[PDB]
From a paper:
Here we report that the 2-aminoisobutyric acid hydroxylase from [name], [name], requires manganese to functionalize a strong, aliphatic C–H bond (BDE = 100 kcal/mol). Structural and spectroscopic studies of this enzyme reveal a redox-active, heterobimetallic manganese–iron active site at the locus of O2 activation and substrate coordination. Metabolism of 2-aminoisobutyric acid (AIB) in [name] proceeds via the initial, selective hydroxylation of the pro-(R) methyl group by the monooxygenase [name] to furnish α-methyl-d-serine (d-MeSer). Previously, recombinant expression of [name] in Escherichia coli enabled its structural characterization and revealed distinct mono- and dinuclear metal binding sites housed within the AibH1 and AibH2 protein subunits, respectively.
We expressed [name] in E. coli grown in M9 minimal medium supplemented with excess FeII, and subsequent purification furnished protein samples (FeAibH1H2) containing ∼3 equiv of Fe per [name] heterodimer and minimal heterometal content (entry 1). Fe occupancy in both the mononuclear (Site 0) and dinuclear (Sites 1 and 2) metal sites was evident by inspection of the anomalous dispersion maps obtained from X-ray diffraction experiments performed on single crystals of FeAibH1H2. [name] had no detectable activity upon the exclusive incorporation of iron ions. To probe whether the absence of monooxygenase activity was caused by the choice of sacrificial reductant, other commonly utilized reducing systems (e.g., NADH/Phenazine, sodium dithionite, and alpha-ketoglutarate) were explored, but none proved competent to produce measurable quantities of d-MeSer with FeAibH1H2. These results suggested that the active form of [name] could not be produced under routine expression and purification conditions typically used for nonheme iron enzymes.
Residue numbers in the entry:
A (entry chain D): 11 to 374
B (entry chain B): 11 to 375
C (entry chain C), D (entry chain A): 29 to 378
Amino acid sequence: TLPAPSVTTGIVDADIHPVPQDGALEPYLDDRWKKHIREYGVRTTTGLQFISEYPQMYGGAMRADAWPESGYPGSDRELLRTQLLDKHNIQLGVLQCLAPGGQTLNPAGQALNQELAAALCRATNDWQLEHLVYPDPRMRAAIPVTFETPDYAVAEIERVGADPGVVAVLGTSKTLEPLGSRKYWPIYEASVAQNLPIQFHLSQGGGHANTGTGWTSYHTEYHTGHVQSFQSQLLSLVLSGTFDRFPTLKVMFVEGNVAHFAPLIQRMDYTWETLRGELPDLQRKPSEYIRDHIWASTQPIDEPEKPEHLAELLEEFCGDNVVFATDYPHFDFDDPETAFPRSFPVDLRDKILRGNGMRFFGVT
Amino acid sequence: TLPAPSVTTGIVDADIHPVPQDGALEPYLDDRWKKHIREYGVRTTTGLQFISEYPQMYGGAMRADAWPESGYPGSDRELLRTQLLDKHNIQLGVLQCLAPGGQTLNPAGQALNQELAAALCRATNDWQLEHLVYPDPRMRAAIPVTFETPDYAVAEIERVGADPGVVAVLGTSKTLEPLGSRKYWPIYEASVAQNLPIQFHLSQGGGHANTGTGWTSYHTEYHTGHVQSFQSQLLSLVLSGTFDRFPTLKVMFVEGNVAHFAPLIQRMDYTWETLRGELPDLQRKPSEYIRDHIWASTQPIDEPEKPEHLAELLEEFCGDNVVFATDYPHFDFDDPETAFPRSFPVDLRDKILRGNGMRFFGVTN
Amino acid sequence: VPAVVDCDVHAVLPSPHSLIPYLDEYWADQLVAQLAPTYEPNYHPRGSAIAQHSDASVDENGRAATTAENLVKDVFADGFTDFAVVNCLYGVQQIHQPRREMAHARALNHWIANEWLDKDDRLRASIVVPQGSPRAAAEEIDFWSGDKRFVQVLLLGQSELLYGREINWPIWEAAEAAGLPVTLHIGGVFRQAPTSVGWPASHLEWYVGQQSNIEAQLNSIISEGILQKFPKTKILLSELGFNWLPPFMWKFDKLWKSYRPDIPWVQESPLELIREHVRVTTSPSDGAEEAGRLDSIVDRLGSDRMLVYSSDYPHKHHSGPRDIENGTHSPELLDRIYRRNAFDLYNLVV
Amino acid sequence: VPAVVDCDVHAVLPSPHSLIPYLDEYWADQLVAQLAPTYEPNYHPRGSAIAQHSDASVDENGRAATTAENLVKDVFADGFTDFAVVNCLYGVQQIHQPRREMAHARALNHWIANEWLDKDDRLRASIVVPQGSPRAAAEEIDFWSGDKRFVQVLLLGQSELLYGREINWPIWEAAEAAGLPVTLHIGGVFRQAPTSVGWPASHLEWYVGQQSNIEAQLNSIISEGILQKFPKTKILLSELGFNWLPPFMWKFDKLWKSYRPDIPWVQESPLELIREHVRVTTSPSDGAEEAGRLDSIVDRLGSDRMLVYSSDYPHKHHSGPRDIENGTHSPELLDRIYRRNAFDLYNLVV
Ligand SMILES: [Fe+3]
Ligand SMILES: [Fe+3]
Ligand SMILES: [Fe+3]
Ligand SMILES: [Fe+3]
Ligand SMILES: [Fe+3]
Ligand SMILES: [Fe+3]
């Protein structure tokens, strides 16, 4: 009986990062998993006990003002309500929790123990609805699920997926197979059956090196390199015909940037002209799927040298499928009043801040 | 209706490599795939059009005397009848077709195009059934399926898996996830329903480097390294509780050697004694799964400096679960008459040639 | 006057036997005992629509560009091209046995000179190098440094380790000190997945996607400091498109501004560094050959010194070796693309 | 008289802050800026049963082996041990940024020297090296060559490329130049899946499984020619078991016979090369402590020279450091293991 999300004068924020407070998941966890995590932590695709393979540089990559009186940035419900939800008149802000907090900062779903992973995803979903979305229904939940055990993720989608406080299904940008692979179609089927779209957020981990040709060294390399994963996942989700099988499926590439998709998509078509006959069951020209199936968030906003270049390239992607995100509380946080260049078209700015997001999330 | 196999005076050979003659698979191939093969070949986990990342060193790694008048070793079924089946009194020759053409190791279920791969898997299974198993049912089929796409695999086990010319499901030793992963449980479920066991043969590819710590350089590294894939699979299949879930599933590791398993399992038990707490749903002690679930084939037989160590290690692994293979027509082919050391006891050799394989493949007398 | 260079055309080795007159007795007996397995790659599958255009002089098997006579015939038939740079993609880099990798890369470059460079003096070639051992790659650059018909060093787009890693520095060292630019051509050793999220299931997926690895290789080369340790280095992107460069450059510049104290030695922007050091061939054009698009892509790069002409003979792309003119209104641009930029690479005159 | 040496015990770095006194201001400031992310490995998860046995001295936080006083109070209490080789497994080798890897590897060793070696002359240690840059790895080995309390080079069982690659030959060269044995310890850089068939789903499956990767390092070391190019090389397997060795040795020998001309420089059997150049620590014993199994495995190795005693302090194993006596009835064997075999590695007299 919670109401559907209503965006009128306010804006849509597609990427918000809450963190559970120390101990706060333990009400939704079996005793065996509390024991497990005390004894072993949340093992993942590293050899490190407490950190990921590229730990963040300058203060954990948090903006230095978002630290509360007790917890990590994102862990205080009141500071997030004031420093974010009111301050920018966000009427729909989508929680994307990528850490169960405490001593572990990797996404739940990427725990190498997948049974632990599904319990962590479940406790996270129960915690973010009871602690944030329901007391402050401006926030809604993108549910983390175990994309590398589809059985467990279908089960979770079917357990909380119809909850009005749920607007999306949260995955990660890196995976063991390209997301266009049949392994993940059951999760799409179970998503669609709840008329839910799916957000893939920037991540490390996954199983392979962070580029297709080696492990990066320097932080410019790691952070810039994040967009390669997204470039790789589009080509597979499109050229696999995932969207033929699932024609009501909405996927958004969250924090992969936007501009680079356009000459990628363009190169896909040009290549596909000559070699289309390798994949004859592909029903449409590759670029044709974008407007129906592929969204992106703005943050971190592209910054071309000629600002006129920006809106040119967002339109070459698809102007109706770019949606605004703060990425609160991270350091490269984008602001709704200051993100776009001074010369930015104003109709495009309003439907990113509003229109396109309402479409992606089924707002009417 | 083809009769069940019967072993009496002869032996089981759990690993024989027949090859389709050129174009022999096309009668069973939808025409869209015959064209895809002309244009792109079979794209796998290489950047190479025709070979795998480690091509054979000397004369195709084949026996020098096993070449027909025309074609690849294993391509002429007459030569295979006289040179192998007749010559060694083989009464159950389990076929494991490793490539769709005149190549040594280029497995079909490993095509990156998994619609292509399930196609060649189905074609291969129709071709070896009509062309070898039914003309001479001393041979039977281990049927390749696409383990990396469990939907197409459960369907191929369903299509042909009940055929009496079929004794086992055929997999590869290397895979993208370790075989105890839930990903592959749908295949184990479909195999239990057809009363079939599973053989995992030595492979390249799979999606990772060929060791867990880099690609090998010289051939001694590549061929000795095959054993490592099998160590890692056994650990995943046992500790994941895969056999808790499917307590009648039988798997054979084929051409992974045998003796190395014994200390592996011993290290597995010993570590678990301290660290069992991490996996408290596992129902049995790790080594207790071996007797009912883990089998191995003998070729290329272990050759310790002191021969009496062979039987020691085979009993430590599990003397009931070792099964003879020749690996015909590969160059390290094992001869039943000469593979066992001079002091080898006869009760154990007779199990390995006969009873052991009979019970794994559901054969009676 | 600067000469019109075709910056990317391909010799196609017919079969491993073609190397036998260029190997020791050991390596040639071994190659025949081994039944001559072929390391022909799958970068352009021989039977697919990109492998060769229809208007190609094929040989007795139906294969374009297995001889110097078949390529010279086609490439220079319209008198427009003065020189061609030959890149043989025969996959010696995927030979894991490193001794055989050296021996087959050496013998490949011998075949290229004797039967292509000695045949037509309008032909230049790159040195193929065995990148499995950087010090062995270095020694083969130096072995071919006396013969100036070799005008660049060939490296595959996908490597074992990123080209900026200290492990790989002896390749830029030897390249700088022999005068040669290094080209990255589409292709790879395939010792990890071609993408960071797994293996591409189709050749098309793989072919389109290899751009991602080139952002990674440039960010590696720049961030690790190759442009400051070997400041004369020039990097040619042969056949990887080029439209993706601007949005990658913009992010790499933005984050350099924050992260700069992590890489203090890079004191000029990556924006400038890429304009001054990186050239990209034009085939494929990836749709910059549509109306006004070549001007747009040159404007987004912020330079017109980068694009260098190539046909990609004999590969068939959706648009042809000169339909790029349909993209621009400047005869100055096309003059730069057609011959002036490539003077910076090779210094070849009419 | 050869000394009884504990060939593998462990120091545990409290936190990265413990590195602050041994870091240049450039890195001390930046570490504190980074809120000091800790590279504590998951090789022995600190809360699992293997991390420490209940008889081990602990600090205020309940952690064993974080000070020289606690370890020395525990290891030498009974008077049986004369020397212990400390290995600090803090995960500097998993730092991707190559310059911070080096600096932290150096501070760590400096930590080891001041807070441990200087505090008790019965302690020796390994040299932690940055394996991301073989050049830096060898320079690190030269720098500690001066201090002879450092008695071996520490490498992890899982590396980025196999240790036998040419790329990695500087480390072998620097180790031989200093007369230092090279040890592989369980642990890894995790720059690929820990197995050739992907990622283990638990630490237990990982921990049992790392023997396979040592088969590959030993095959690569021997196959690529390390023991002929650096014939004084000694290799000690540390805390990787040993019962897996014979079947690996026999198969490797059998295949060497089959492939001699592929590796012509290998003129001795890998059976003989391994018995001569490979030593193995005895903790964990993995079932060789049961009746007669220690005689049986030495029979299977073909050598009584390979096993050297360790306790693996402070880890907990199913059997104790001296329980290996239940597997033998040879006083002379227990003498090679406790005393004489380790003399070949460290030449330490009591
Ligand atoms: Fe974010
Ligand atoms: Fe962020
Ligand atoms: Fe075989
Ligand atoms: Fe074989
Ligand atoms: Fe080209
Ligand atoms: Fe240890």
